[PDB]
Amino acid sequence: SMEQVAMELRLTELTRLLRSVLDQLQDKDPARIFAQPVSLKEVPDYLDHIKHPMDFATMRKRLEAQGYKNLHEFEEDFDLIIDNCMKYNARDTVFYRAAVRLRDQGGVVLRQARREVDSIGLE
Ligand SMILES: Cn1c(=O)ccc2cc(N)ccc21
Numbered sequence: 001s002m003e004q005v006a007m008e009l010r011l012t013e014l015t016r017l018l019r020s021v022l023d024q025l026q027d028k029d030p031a032r033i034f035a036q037p038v039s040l041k042e043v044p045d046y047l048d049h050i051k052h053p054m055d056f057a058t059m060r061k062r063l064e065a066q067g068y069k070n071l072h073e074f075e076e077d078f079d080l081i082i083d084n085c086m087k088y089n090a091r092d093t094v095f096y097r098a099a100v101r102l103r104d105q106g107g108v109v110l111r112q113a114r115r116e117v118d119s120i121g122l123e
Helices: 004-027 056-064 071-088 094-120
Strands: none
Touching: 004 056, 004 071, 004 094, 056 071, 071 094
16 A cells, blocks of 8 residues: 555654664764673673663664664663663773763764654654
8 A cells, every 4th residue: 555655664764864863872882882782601690680681783683674663662772771781780880881971972862863753753
């Protein structure tokens, strides 16, 4: 149907915008601490602590499969990256502090992304 196609076009547009947001957010992690999943080989107890791991590579895979239907779903995964890290690692670690900086700097990007999704009407 034409309606289905139109819906798919909107999703494709959302995916394009979220790809830009994702690139901007990942730029705020220059250490690449959050680039890849935490290695379960190197951190064998990780899943005892963290029930829903997340990282930028995993987000990018979902994004390219057009698996984010709206911005909230994308934000939920970004928040997992930060929140998981701030629980597993103590305040006096480079990991926790990287997450705080990513949260603080990412908030600016997400603030405007929300306005853009709303104004263009991508959800
Ligand atoms: C425990 N942990 C995190 O929580 C986040 C990122 C990270 C990166 C490496 N390379 C090792 C451990 C890590």
